[PDB]
């Protein structure tokens, strides 16, 4: 995250950190005690699907404070329409091997209904994005979880204000074109969280962009509203042997 601030411990309690062999991979968002939403592109280079760990309740990577809860990732579910190395359909649904325990430091973000998200949340101007990504373009990643408030653009406006992949109906732009504030590479998969009348909801996933807080370019986020029914159906499904599952979309 460029140009944000430390998320005070416990104020981003849905944030997930994904590790592969102990190394930071991506972020994610807890939506229930066993389900995490992240970005499909997080998994394009995974060799051993069995060394993926999700951590809940994380804050400062330098220390253990006992609020962290680690789980193995039992299933990584990606839409059939996602193509590795490209941008569209950049979402993944992760099933943990055992539920997390909800606590003051571990709380799911609400996965909204489609209509609500489309008709109401999509018009809330600012939303929070978070992660342990780079604090600067070509810079070190953060040790404490960072958070940034970013305004969403209508895609027609993003395209006009920007100056290379299309912004498709499965995406939206958010952030700033002046190079000050963005999510970046290592925040991939993390939440874009939208407040409405006292409750926070999942509206986007840190997906892609140019560089990092690059002048003339906004952050691009997966439009989670396109996937609500896909996600809900998969959450009602039985697990299948083998970590990776490609599931039909729609």
């Amino acid at each position: 995250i460029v140009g944000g601030k430390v998320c005070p411990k416990g104020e981003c309690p849905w944030q997930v950190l994904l590790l592969v062999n102990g190394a930071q991979l991506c972020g994610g968002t807890l939506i229930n005690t066993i389900w995490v939403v992240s970005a499909a592109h997080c998994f394009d280079k995974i060799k051993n699907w069995r060394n993926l760990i999700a951590v809940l309740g994380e804050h400062d990577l330098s220390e253990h404070d006992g609020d962290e809860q680690s789980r193995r990732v039992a299933q990584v579910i990606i839409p059939s329409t996602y193509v590795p190395g490209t941008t569209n359909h950049d979402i993944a649904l992760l099933r943990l091997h055992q539920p997390v325990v909800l606590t003051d430091h571990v709380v799911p973000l609400c996965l909204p209904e489609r209509t609500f998200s489309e008709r109401t949340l999509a018009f809330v101007r600012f939303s929070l994005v978070s992660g342990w990504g780079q604090l600067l373009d070509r810079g070190a990643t953060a040790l404490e979880l960072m958070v940034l408030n970013v305004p969403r653009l209508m895609t027609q406006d993003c395209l006009q204000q920007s100056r290379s992949p299309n912004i498709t109906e499965y995406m939206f732009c958010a952030g700033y074109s002046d190079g000050s504030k963005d999510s970046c590479k290592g925040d991939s998969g993390g939440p874009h969280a939208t407040h409405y009348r006292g409750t926070w909801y999942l509206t986007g996933i840190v997906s892609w962009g140019q560089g990092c807080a690059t002048v003339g370019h906004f952050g691009v986020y997966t439009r989670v509203s396109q996937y609500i029914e896909w996600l809900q159906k998969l959450m009602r499904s039985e697990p299948r042997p083998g970590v990776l599952l490609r599931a039909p979309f729609p």
Partner: protein
Amino acid sequence: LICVNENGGCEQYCSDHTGTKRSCRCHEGYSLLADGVSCTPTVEYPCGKIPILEKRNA
């Protein structure tokens, strides 16, 4: 009231029904109050609420 305007006045989710009818609903872990619009937590850790802030304002 229609769900497309002002969220049908619902705090959370809204369904349009045949008639000038609307029903608000709440996410799991909440219940709908008698106002027909407001949602109140029914569990300790409902989604989308930040416990250390909810306790900061209790």
